[PDB]
Amino acid sequence: SPNAAVQSGLQEWHRIIAEADWERLPDLLAEDVVFSNPSTFDPYHGKGPLMVILPAVFSVLENFQYARHFSSKSGYVLEFNANMGDELLTGVDLIEFNDAGKITDLVVMMRPASVVIDLSVEVGKRIAAAQS
Amino acid sequence: SPNAAVQSGLQEWHRIIAEADWERLPDLLAEDVVFSNPSTFDPYHGKGPLMVILPAVFSVLENFQYARHFSSKSGYVLEFNANMGDELLTGVDLIEFNDAGKITDLVVMMRPASVVIDLSVEVGKRIAAAQ
DSSP, rough: HHHHHHHHHHHHHHHOOOOOTTGGGGHHHHEEEEEOOOOOSSSSSSSSOOOOOOHHHHHHEEEEEEEEEEEEEEEEEEEEEEETHHHHHHHEEEEEETSSSSSEEEEEEEEEEHHHHHHHHHHHHHTTTTOO | OOOOOHHHHHHHHHHHHHHTTTGHHHHEEEEEEEOOSSSSOOOOEEEEHHHHHHHHHHHHOEEEEEEEEEESSSEEEEEEEETTTTEEEEEEEEEETTSSSOEEEEEEEOOOOHHHHHHHHHHHHHHHHHH
């Protein structure tokens, strides 16, 4: 069962996602955070890639809803449902926190794969079109 | 934290996957088990589809190894690593158990998506071949 700091980090993750409050994302991330995304195998390192990619990914997911959740001593897996137009999907956010309650690892996976292929094209376009 | 029957069910799941002992898997499944696979959205229902698909998938995966794991009152998420030839992937098995220690839901997801597409073509071939 995770400590108070980790639980607080989870609460903040949820708030940032619920409110799309991306300006507060960097303070939640550890400097050395790793990010593994649904469409390419190599991880991204550091806060910058997450600052660029996450808001775009969440911008494409419609009717985003967290579903079943699971915990370890240090982290969580958060299942979710969503759609991109008429393309339905489910996925997980696997999130690891350090003792200070900062995110050290984020892995995102989605299914079915065919929808992830489509979503990743749109995410690329969303990143190119970002206004902040 | 799951109960004793569920913990025992998880142990048997691990054994079956580790040995590829598919003949014992039906005994571990609830009759109305729901299975959500990495390549199409709609879940499958009942033991049959799961017993056709899951063994074929594992026949194509190499060096399958469980990594991080997580739990809820009734289930687990088991992260894994594996490869198909020189194409590496990671994934999760989300597994829910009932109070009898039988699997009611299995969801499998993998990344990256491009590798899953390749995997699904090979799994289809093997299902066909075995049919």
